[PDB]
Design a protein around this ligand. Structure first.
Ligand SMILES: Nc1ncnc2c1ncn2[C@@H]1O[C@H](COP(=O)(O)OP(=O)(O)OP(=O)(O)O)[C@@H](O)[C@H]1O
Ligand SMILES: Nc1ncnc2c1ncn2[C@@H]1O[C@H](COP(=O)(O)OP(=O)(O)OP(=O)(O)O)[C@@H](O)[C@H]1O
Ligand SMILES: Nc1ncnc2c1ncn2[C@@H]1O[C@H](COP(=O)(O)OP(=O)(O)O)[C@@H](O)[C@H]1O
Ligand SMILES: [Mg+2]
Ligand SMILES: [Mg+2]
Ligand SMILES: [Mg+2]
Lengths: 47, 47, 92, 501, 469, 483
């Protein structure tokens, strides 16, 4: 009897979805700031 | 090689097909006598 | 419902009791009866001391030549057909 | 060409015989029920009229259950089965080396016929308890991980177990290729005559394999039996014994052999089919009760005869496929309790980049210290201890910092050793090059070198030792130990080289 | 000859003969049937009986019906006159267009090519699919397989492979649907008429079709695979051509064998499958290999009951493939269509000698990063993403970028997603993944890589997403 | 005695009769026992025939005389069955008198091949906001309904059956969809309650109800789905659309297993015979959509499966999931957390799907799919926001509350479009999450009262015109401010 790697998501339990919640927090916020930065960049390159 | 393979694999079929129609001749008595002799030898060597 | 199976078996049980070994000679084609005489007189050379021969001839043109002889179990095949396939096998 | 085929015809055997005979009562699913054959030995080769073979496996009181060695499309209720009197046997000798034979020792390579003189049964008994002598010689597999952490002596069964596509056949083929250096040299006490039994594979796979072996010019000493997926169940149940008999010939002829069954979990399936169709009682997972006797009486022929019976040998590397690391299934445990070890392969390791994907935590060898050369022994003792220390605290790896400098040292050593064990494909290394690399690894001559570069170093170092200090390597190899002079010379080479890179 | 039916149990008919028995695998014609009913012999029960599996429903069979021995196994039409013609398991048109006028008939139960005939060459094939062409390149003329449970995308993926390779392929093609929906049957038929690969006016069709869709009796789903395989085997051998052979499913073949095995009086094996699973699959999956006479590129859609890859059916089939592309439902429910699993997928031609160092190392970097991401996911579930290291968040972001980038909008999925089909030449996939792994796009958002073709489309999408921000 | 046309029972027991004789009996032909009963000769052995008695075999004794009828099993069909409760053989059991049909039809018939069928194009309005929007169903499509005990599956079925009353009372005939409900293995009480609740909607004037309840012998439960499918194939062939709701199918699989373990046929997995796949496939492949050279009929099938402990990976659930063109995964924890009907989206696919929908509803459902997909990615945040993610959570809550629905109250498609458009256009993102229900009900009442013109426009033109959109937006805003 043994375990594996990356199974806390495969089980699909409570942690398997809280993990998605956490990752999505982080990367939605990062995508927001990155979109703002890319805007800023193009709107500066207008000059 | 290829030509020789074709040649021999056709020779075998041609001659065997000739033989399977050549056996239809009237050599029956020779075969029967030979087989009875074979019976003689087998019976002798079977005990 | 299977009484005929019983008696038939019993016959096979009595035949061997009196010692009449089954035989059979499948021939390339029609056969003479003098040839059958020599055949019986030579097959009697296979029995033990006392047994009897019960030869059931059968004509067979499906084979090519020679003959197939069954005696009890012992099976000797000298039909030209098997010789032809044996030779083709060997030289293939 | 006709001038050639008449000696083909002449070289025949036209004679006939008074033979016994039964007649088929039934047929279907590949199982004839012959009736008669009153004097048929159990496990004997009978021949049907059409030309097939059969192995009269199940002598019942009234009929004999024969298993056809091929498609029974050619058989009909009424056909004639003529016994031959012979238990199943196969050709042997050194005529097979370089050929490809099927389960019954018939060249399926074209490439002419087998010219063997001597045949040999397939159901012989293993040598007793007195003939054998302890396992002492090593079998250099040429793989860093296998050859240092889980050694393999000659005369030892070493399961290679693991999930699908983790690199089992690759380990076996690296082992086969490595023996070239021995089989080209001079001494006859180091020549290994590899054999490779391919069961259940498809002929494309065996063809690619023989292509690899021919490219690496490793066929001049290899036999390759093959009972591929399309060959009827009996020819897969019977190939391992054909291989093991071809190897027993060498073993009892004072030579050293090596036989690789691949897989055995397909011989077991073929035997299960053969049994379930003969109607023998089933058991767990439907396997009969013999699926242990089956393997055991096979993997117990791999012996190491003493010096009175010749001194021969016969290694064995049964490959087993486990369904998602289910080592508790029936066959994996049946074949794990017969052998002297196991080289566990895992797919978490295969994709982390640790290739060959060996899992030193689960892999063990029950000969151990023996079956290594004193040089590799000196190096691998420390390497094994260091890796064991690393594994138990690798859980912190994802942090590393925020931890004591002692565990930081342990991680910074285990990482380098793990990266040193990574190896290429079909690139086995002589033992002395392995010793050189792992010496440069375990003595601290990399701890200050970033892990990402270790592989580079490794290769570079080899090329800088092979082409420069062949004398030192020969000194290590001819006497398989590191005399203080050789130790210091290795230290100097490692240090000065690392300095210039 | 002529025998009689003595028993009719389920879909298994026992026929008693007084003349000579017919060898196994022959075809028997039951007389007095409105629709041709063809049995195949599969045993010789002794006492001059035979047991046969029927290829059509056994309704109306009466104990005693006379049955005619055909003489040879099921023979079907073959040749270039079966192109664009749908066929039954027994090669009789089911497209209501009249007989198949051919010259050569072929018997479906043949033998595999022998070892001396195997061809040992292999060279990549370009399917224009990012994930497939990158992590699991498809050998030309080599057996392929599309595992995965139900509803993951096997049929859509085969539709894509048809759409691309079929037309982009010179030689003929064959699609042998075994035991799958009939709706999909005519959907394929109509799609192919639209594409023009099948023409109902000229003799310019390129695809033959064979259908044993799952409303047929089990006896006729275990053999339609062999009918399609026979047609393709003829186009390989006699026509000296290059053939594409699509099979979908090829698990219904083993299932349909399992359905009748018990009635044939056989103990049932591991999971209810017939005892003869492995060899019945071997005697079929080894008439599909490429040989020295011709080339068959065989794409097979293999079901996986309950997404269990350990089941005996897929577990056995894994040994009969070059490239195995295991679709996953864990990845199909993230919207990453095609659902391919980048880690279960495998190929035989993924050796740097056959794809080169650039491609090999790009792919192995991708796999390493995805596995490391899986390892971290165990941690992100306790901590939360914030408490991670600073070098890790980089790896997780890169893994997410790659995972999204492996998706792609298919030409046949224009009706699901509403997108436009994209193809990606291999070199461009390698370029894009090299750049992503190197960090050249580490500034872009992740949703820039979702459902885009070449990477340049990723940058354009990043723009258009930042504009509306 | 005439052993050619008439045999004698040998060993009746537990429902299966061996019959000696009947030498000219066809396989799966119907024999009549001397006691009014009937049976179907399934096993044809070399000596005796294994017949299955369509009833209780109290009345059968060894020595009885079985006599074949001469025709493979068949059932009455026609328009004369509508609004009747019939037995699995076609014998009315509602006490309304003789069934009175002018045509029989075989049960073990063959599904239409490749050529007759044409792609699925029209919509089959279910009237359930969660199905018409997200997992739509087209005519000619087979759409499983799989869920644990008591999660509202017969609720989906009966909402679908009731909703067709909008169409079955109109002038058009290409919109009329007759319904068939096959009750396998239920209670007589449950079927009677179902018929009573149908009659209260006057939805029995165009429905048939085949009934093989729990007590009826196993063969009748095994044969009910085929009887229903034949009664529906009549309409399909004759150019009239139809529907059919097997409820459940797992009970048919159980009945078949019993019937096949009593004929001594060996078992397979879970003791089911080997064929439990060829049992359902044979049946479901009959749900076709014939082309216009074959009439243009159709037969939508809605098999209902009950998984054991939410185990979709069992034997029969995965035997049927691989046969149908989609799923409707009823979850038994969405059913408590509030969502009713418990349809689980994201897992509920419709392999035909979008092509079936109606453009009007497609306009809004397309956007709703994406909004809910994002909401379900980030709905795991009760554990703990940004402006955008806060907006997404709010919008998702609004839409989820919109999907909820009453019971036996299907709503027209135009009203569904009205509500969904209101929700997906941001004219809700300020209301209290629990106010959505009352707002939705009141909005229905309003728009039904006053703006029958706009709803009629959407319904007739099938799409939200720009003028239609403008008027709809005006109503939504003038009401929300009036809320
Ligand atoms: N040392 C290695 N370095 C890189 N890749 C490797 C190595 N060893 C094996 N592989 C890869 O692993 C894959 C599978 O290899 P192999 O066939 O040896 O495993 P297997 O378990 O025998 O496969 P199967 O079980 O399907 O027969 C190969 O494609 C090969 O590229
Ligand atoms: N949309 C809904 N709103 C409120 N209640 C509902 C809804 N759907 C179903 N229910 C309730 O669920 C209960 C059981 O539902 P139903 O019997 O239709 O499901 P079922 O699983 O088919 O039942 P069973 O499986 O026991 O036959 C009913 O009493 C009904 O009131
Ligand atoms: N490339 C894709 N884009 C979007 N959806 C897809 C794609 N491929 C498959 N699907 C989804 O999968 C469903 C089709 O699944 P299908 O492949 O027919 O199942 P199976 O693989 O079991 O045959 C469609 O309804 C669709 O939603
Ligand atoms: Mg292998
Ligand atoms: Mg499909
Ligand atoms: Mg219910």
């Amino acid at each position: 009897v043994r375990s594996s790697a990356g199974a806390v998501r495969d089980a699909g339990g409570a942690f398997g979805k809280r993990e998605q919640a956490e990752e999505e927090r982080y990367f939605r916020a990062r995508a927001k700031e990155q979109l703002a930065a890319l805007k800023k960049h193009h709107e500066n390159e207008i000059s | 090689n290829m030509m020789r393979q074709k040649e021999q694999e056709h020779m075998i079929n041609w001659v065997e097909k000739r033989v399977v129609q050549s056996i239809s001749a009237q050599q029956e008595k020779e075969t029967i006598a030979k087989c009875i002799a074979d019976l003689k030898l087998l019976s002798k060597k079977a005990q | 419902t299977n009484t005929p199976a019983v008696i038939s078996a019993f016959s096979t049980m009595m035949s061997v009791h009196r010692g009449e070994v089954p035989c059979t000679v499948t021939t390339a084609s029609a056969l003479d009866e003098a040839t059958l005489t020599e055949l019986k007189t030579v097959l009697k050379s296979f029995l033990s001391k006392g047994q009897v021969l019960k030869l059931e001839v059968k004509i067979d043109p499906s084979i090519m030549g020679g003959m197939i002889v069954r005696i009890g179990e012992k099976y000797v095949d000298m039909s030209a057909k098997t010789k032809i396939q044996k030779l083709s096998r060997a030289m293939r | 060409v006709s001038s050639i085929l008449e000696e083909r015809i002449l070289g025949a055997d036209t004679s006939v015989d008074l033979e016994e005979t039964g007649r088929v009562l039934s047929i279907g699913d590949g199982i004839a029920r012959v009736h008669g054959l009153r004097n048929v030995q159990a496990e004997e080769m009978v021949e049907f009229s059409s030309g097939l073979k059969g192995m009269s496996l199940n002598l019942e009181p009234d009929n004999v259950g024969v298993v056809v060695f091929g498609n029974d499309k050619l058989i009909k209720e009424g056909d004639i089965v003529k016994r031959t009197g012979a238990i199943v046997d196969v050709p042997v000798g050194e005529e097979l080396l370089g050929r490809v034979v099927d389960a019954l020792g018939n060249a399926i390579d074209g490439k002419g016929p087998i010219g063997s003189k001597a045949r040999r049964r397939v159901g012989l008994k293993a040598p007793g308890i007195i003939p054998r002598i302890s396992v002492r010689e090593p079998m250099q597999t040429g793989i860093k991980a296998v050859d240092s952490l889980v050694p393999i002596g000659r005369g030892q069964r070493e399961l290679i177990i693991g999930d699908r596509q983790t690199g089992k056949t690759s380990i076996a083929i690296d082992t086969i290729i490595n023996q070239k250096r021995f089989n080209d040299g001079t001494d006859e006490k180091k020549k290994l005559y590899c054999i490779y039994v391919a069961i259940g594979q498809k002929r494309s796979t065996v063809a690619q394999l023989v292509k690899r072996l021919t490219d690496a010019d490793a066929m001049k000493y290899t036999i390759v039996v093959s009972a591929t997926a399309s060959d009827a169940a009996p020819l897969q149940y019977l190939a391992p014994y054909s291989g093991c008999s071809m190897g027993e010939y060498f073993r009892d002829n004072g030579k050293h052999a090596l036989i690789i069954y691949d897989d055995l979990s397909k011989q077991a399936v073929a035997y299960r089919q053969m049994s379930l169709l003969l109607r023998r009682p089933p058991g767990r997972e439907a396997y009969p009760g013999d699926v242990f006797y089956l393997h055991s009486r096979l993997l117990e022929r791999a012996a190491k005869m003493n010096d009175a019976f010749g001194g021969g040998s016969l290694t064995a590397l049964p490959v087993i496929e486990t369904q998602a690391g289910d080592v508790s299934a029936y066959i994996p445990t049946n074949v794990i309790s017969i052998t002297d070890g196991q080289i566990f392969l895992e797919t978490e390791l295969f994709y982390k980049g640790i290739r060959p994907a060996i899992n030193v935590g689960l892999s063990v060898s029950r000969v151990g210290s023996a079956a290594q050369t004193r040089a590799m022994k000196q190096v691998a003792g420390t390497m094994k201890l260091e890796l064991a220390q690393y594994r138990e605290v690798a859980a912190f790896a994802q942090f590393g910092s925020d931890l004591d400098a002692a565990t930081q040292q342990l991680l910074s050593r285990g990482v380098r050793l793990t990266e040193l064990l990574k190896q290429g494909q079909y690139s086995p290394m002589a033992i002395e090059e392995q010793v050189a690399v792992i010496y440069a690894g375990v003595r601290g001559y990399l701890d200050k070198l970033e892990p990402s570069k270790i592989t580079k170093f490794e290769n570079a170092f080899l090329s800088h030792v092979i082409s420069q200090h062949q004398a030192l390597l020969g000194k290590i190899r001819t006497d398989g130990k590191i005399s203080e002079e050789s130790d210091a010379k290795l230290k100097e080479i490692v240090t000065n080289f690392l300095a210039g890179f | 000859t002529t025998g009689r039916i003595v028993a009719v149990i389920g879909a298994v008919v026992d026929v008693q003969f007084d003349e000579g028995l017919p060898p196994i695998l022959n075809a028997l014609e039951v007389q007095g049937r409105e629709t041709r009913l063809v049995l195949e012999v599969a045993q010789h029960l002794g006492e001059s009986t035979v047991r046969t599996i029927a290829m059509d429903g056994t309704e109306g069979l009466v104990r005693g019906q006379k049955v005619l021995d055909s003489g040879a196994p099921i023979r079907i039409p073959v040749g270039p006159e079966t192109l664009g013609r749908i066929m039954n398991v027994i090669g009789e048109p089911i497209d209501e267009r009249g007989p198949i006028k051919t010259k050569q008939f072929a018997a479906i139960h043949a033998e595999a090519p022998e070892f001396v005939e195997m061809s040992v060459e292999q060279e990549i094939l370009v399917t224009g699919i990012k994930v497939v062409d990158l992590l699991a390149p498809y050998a030309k003329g080599g057996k392929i397989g599309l595992f995965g449970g139900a509803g993951v995308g096997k049929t859509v993926l085969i539709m894509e492979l048809i759409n691309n390779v079929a037309k982009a392929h010179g030689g003929y093609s064959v699609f042998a649907g075994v035991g799958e929906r009939t709706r999909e049957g005519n959907d394929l038929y109509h799609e192919m008429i639209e594409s023009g690969v099948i023409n109902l006016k000229d003799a310019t069709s390129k695809v033959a079709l064979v259908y044993g869709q799952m409303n047929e009796p089990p006896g006729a789903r275990a053999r339609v695979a062999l009918t399609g395989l026979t047609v393709a085997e003829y186009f390989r051998d006699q026509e000296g051509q290059d053939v594409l052979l699509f099979i979908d499913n090829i698990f219904r073949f083993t299932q349909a064998g399992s359905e009748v095995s018990a009635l044939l009086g056989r103990i049932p094996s591991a999971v209810g499958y017939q005892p003869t699973l492995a060899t019945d699959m071997g005697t079929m999956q080894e008439r599909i290999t490429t040989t020295k006479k011709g080339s068959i590129t065989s794409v097979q859609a293999i079901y996986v009951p309950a997404d269990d890859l350990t089941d005996p059916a897929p577990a056995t089939t894994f040994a009969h493939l070059d490239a195995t592309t295991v679709l996953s439902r864990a990845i199909a429910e993230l919207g990453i269509y095609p659902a391919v699993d980048p880690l279960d997928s495998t190929s035989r031609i993924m050796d740097p000698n056959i794809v080169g160092s650039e491609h090999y190392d790009v792919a192995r970097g991708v796999q390493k990063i995805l596995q490391d991401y899986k390892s971290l996911q165990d941690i992100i579930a306790i901590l939360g993403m914030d408490e991670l290291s600073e070098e890790d968040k980089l790896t997780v972001s890169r893994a997410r970028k790659i995972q999204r980038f492996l998706s792609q909008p298919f030409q046949v999925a224009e009706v699901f997603t509403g997108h436009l089909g994209k193809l990606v030449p291999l070199k461009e996939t390698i370029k894009g993944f090299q750049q992503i792994l190197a960090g050249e796009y580490d500034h872009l958002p992740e949703q820039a890589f979702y459902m885009v073709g070449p990477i340049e489309e990723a940058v354009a999408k990043a723009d258009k997403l930042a504009e509306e921000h």
